[PDB]
Amino acid sequence: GAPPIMGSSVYITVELAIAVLAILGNVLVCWAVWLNSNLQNVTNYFVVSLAAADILVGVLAIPFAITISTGFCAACHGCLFIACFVLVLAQSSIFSLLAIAIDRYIAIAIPLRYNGLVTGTRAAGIIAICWVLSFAIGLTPMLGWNNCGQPKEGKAHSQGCGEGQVACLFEDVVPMNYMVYFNFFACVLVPLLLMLGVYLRIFAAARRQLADLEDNWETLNDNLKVIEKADNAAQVKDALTKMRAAALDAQKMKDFRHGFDILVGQIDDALKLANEGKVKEAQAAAEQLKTTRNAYIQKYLERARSTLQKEVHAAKSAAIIAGLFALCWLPLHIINCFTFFCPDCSHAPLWLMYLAIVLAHTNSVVNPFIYAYRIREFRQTFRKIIRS
Numbered sequence: 001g002a003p004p005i006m007g008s009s010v011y012i013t014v015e016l017a018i019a020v021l022a023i024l025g026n027v028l029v030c031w032a033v034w035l036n037s038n039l040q041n042v043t044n045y046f047v048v049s050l051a052a053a054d055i056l057v058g059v060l061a062i063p064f065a066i067t068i069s070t071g072f073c074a075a076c077h078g079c080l081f082i083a084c085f086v087l088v089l090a091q092s093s094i095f096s097l098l099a100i101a102i103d104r105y106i107a108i109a110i111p112l113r114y115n116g117l118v119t120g121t122r123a124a125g126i127i128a129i130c131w132v133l134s135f136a137i138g139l140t141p142m143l144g145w146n147n148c149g150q151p152k153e154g155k156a157h158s159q160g161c162g163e164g165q166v167a168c169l170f171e172d173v174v175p176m177n178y179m180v181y182f183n184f185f186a187c188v189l190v191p192l193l194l195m196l197g198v199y200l201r202i203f204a205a206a207r208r209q210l211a212d213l214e215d216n217w218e219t220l221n222d223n224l225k226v227i228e229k230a231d232n233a234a235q236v237k238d239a240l241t242k243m244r245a246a247a248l249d250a251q252k253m254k255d256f257r258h259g260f261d262i263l264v265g266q267i268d269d270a271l272k273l274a275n276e277g278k279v280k281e282a283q284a285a286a287e288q289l290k291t292t293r294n295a296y297i298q299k300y301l302e303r304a305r306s307t308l309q310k311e312v313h314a315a316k317s318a319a320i321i322a323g324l325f326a327l328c329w330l331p332l333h334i335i336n337c338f339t340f341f342c343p344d345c346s347h348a349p350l351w352l353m354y355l356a357i358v359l360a361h362t363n364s365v366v367n368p369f370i371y372a373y374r375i376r377e378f379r380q381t382f383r384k385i386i387r388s
């Protein structure tokens with residue numbers, strides 16, 4: 001058996017490398033939001049809460065994991081605290097990710113009341129509540145659900161520990177039934193699945209809205225053709241009444257309101273002629289609608305489409321971040337499941353525990369990269385911060 005300081009040297013060096021990069025990248029995220037008012041919105045207050053959690057992974061959770069890798073003698077509840085603290089930060093991350101998903105759902109499903117409903121003041125209070133709940137959930141073992149009543153006395157004596165002390169190792173103090181049923185199933189898997197459901201609803205809502213935009217445009221152009229080849233005033237009137245309802249339905253900024261004003265007025269003009277039995281005059285008046293459509297309506301159509309595509313792009317970036325949290329944390333949770341549910345299976349070997357721990361920690365590095373690669377306003381602010 002090779003000297004343990006050699007393998008732990010590699011593990012510890014990698015942990016420290018991750019801690020440095022987790023602190024630097026997420027400090028940059030927080031600085032960017034602090035400095036750029038275009039980045040100061042409710043979505044990005046949850047982004048900052050998530051960056052703060054990742055900063056604390058570098059400042060506290062990684063030094064704690066390095067300390068625990070030594071198995072040093074410690075009062076059992078002190079060991080328990082440094083072992084559980086990373087769970088607080090993971091839980092807070094989950095609350096932030098779920099809040100971000102819900103925020104984007106509200107923005108796409110009910111844009112007209114988003115600004116009245118989702119305010120910065122309410123967001124700060126939500127963030128404070130979620131941090132309190134993260135402490136309660138992550139430190140729940142400190143309330144008595146722990147293995148400190150059954151210390152491994154042979155291991156403690158072999159290391160020369162003193163009274164009330166244990167060799168400090170995560171699995172000796174944190175119960176695995178808490179880790180699997182309460183932390184993983186209830187507090188991690190369930191929120192991640194709820195997030196998956198929110199994102200499905202976001203993309204379905206976008207796809208449906210971009211469909212309805214295209215439907216109204218098609219109805220407008222189809223009914224223009226119907227009028228042109230109509231044969232009596234009654235047919236002209238039928239198509240015009242559909243167009244009028246569809247115009248108001250698409251009405252639901254000054255040049256925008258002017259263009260629809262023109263449009264509905266021109267439909268009313270032609271409809272009045274059609275009811276008077278003046279087919280040719282009604283058809284000629286309807287042809288004027290094509291001038292309004294080119295100058296105004298199509299511009300509104302293109303801008304509505306472009307706004308929806310930007311909402312889709314923003315939601316995908318947020319979903320990538322949630323998906324990467326899952327990818328990085330799941331191996332460690334799955335290993336706990338094997339330890340717990342398969343007592344006939346040999347425990348995952350030490351090199352694999354190390355690997356799964358640093359994979360989980362690497363998730364605290366990756367978000368600033370996603371923001372830089374996918375969000376212009378962050379990328380340009382990062383550049384100004386780094387340059388200046």
Ligand SMILES: CC(C)CCC[C@@H](C)[C@H]1CC[C@H]2[C@@H]3CC=C4C[C@@H](O)CC[C@]4(C)[C@H]3CC[C@]12C
Pocket residue numbers: 073074075077078079081082
């Ligand atoms: C505001 C921040 C920076 C302060 C951080 C304080 C941290 C480092 C403190 C808070 C409580 C402390 C623990 C409390 C009790 C014990 C039991 C002892 O047998 C070994 C040390 C150990 C495990 C301590 C390690 C350091 C510790 C985790």
Ligand SMILES: CC(C)CCC[C@@H](C)[C@H]1CC[C@H]2[C@@H]3CC=C4C[C@@H](O)CC[C@]4(C)[C@H]3CC[C@]12C
Pocket residue numbers: 075076077078079081
């Ligand atoms: C911002 C400030 C107030 C942080 C407050 C955290 C304090 C109150 C908590 C955090 C961790 C706690 C320690 C965790 C574990 C142990 C080991 C146990 O054998 C005696 C108590 C002791 C030493 C606790 C004392 C209280 C403690 C230090």
Ligand SMILES: CC(C)CCC[C@@H](C)[C@H]1CC[C@H]2[C@@H]3CC=C4C[C@@H](O)CC[C@]4(C)[C@H]3CC[C@]12C
Pocket residue numbers: 327330331332334335338345346347348349352
């Ligand atoms: C989330 C995505 C990346 C899936 C990752 C799956 C990983 C975590 C899976 C795939 C194969 C699994 C291993 C397969 C067999 C064993 C041997 C057993 O005696 C201990 C657990 C152990 C070592 C498993 C640990 C978990 C494991 C490494």
Ligand SMILES: CC(C)CCC[C@@H](C)[C@H]1CC[C@H]2[C@@H]3CC=C4C[C@@H](O)CC[C@]4(C)[C@H]3CC[C@]12C
Pocket residue numbers: 334337338341342
């Ligand atoms: C997408 C979501 C649902 C991922 C969560 C799936 C998890 C909970 C699944 C993936 C593979 C599963 C493991 C596959 C094999 C075994 C070995 C068996 O002797 C006990 C159960 C155990 C250890 C399973 C426990 C549950 C498990 C870890």
Ligand SMILES: CCCCCCCC/C=C\CCCCCCCC(=O)OC[C@H](O)CO
Pocket residue numbers: 059060063064067072073074
């Ligand atoms: C800006 C600063 C922000 C705050 C920065 C916080 C840094 C915490 C660092 C390391 C935690 C190490 C955990 C404590 C290591 C314990 C070693 C020990 O206690 O030795 C006991 C042994 O039994 C002999 O008595």
Ligand SMILES: CC(C)(C)CC(=O)Nc1c(F)cc(C(=O)Nc2nccs2)cc1F
Pocket residue numbers: 064065066068069070086087169170171179332333336353354357
């Ligand atoms: C590697 C050792 C065995 C030599 C020391 C040790 O016990 N290290 C350790 C640690 F510091 C943190 C965790 C941890 O965070 N596990 C989680 N599972 C799900 C969410 S967090 C697991 C660990 F094994």
Ligand SMILES: CCCCCCCC/C=C\CCCCCCCC(=O)O
Pocket residue numbers: 008009010012013016017020
């Ligand atoms: C542009 C560069 C950004 C800053 C770079 C900082 C580099 C820090 C990286 C790794 C720290 C490695 C220290 C290794 C000492 C551990 C010794 C041991 O295992 O006992």
Ligand SMILES: CCCCCCCC/C=C\CCCCCCCC(=O)O
Pocket residue numbers: 059063066067070072
């Ligand atoms: C920005 C400030 C961040 C804080 C710096 C702290 C980093 C130190 C890293 C690891 C601490 C390791 C704890 C030592 C274990 C003791 C081993 C033993 O006692 O047997």
Ligand SMILES: CCCCCCCC/C=C\CCCCCCCC(=O)O
Pocket residue numbers: 129133136137
């Ligand atoms: C440890 C398990 C979780 C604990 C469950 C119950 C603890 C807290 C419950 C609810 C917090 C709800 C916040 C409502 C505060 C009122 C704010 C307002 O004025 O509108």
Ligand code: NA
Pocket residue numbers: 050053054089090093363364
């Ligand atoms: Na995180």
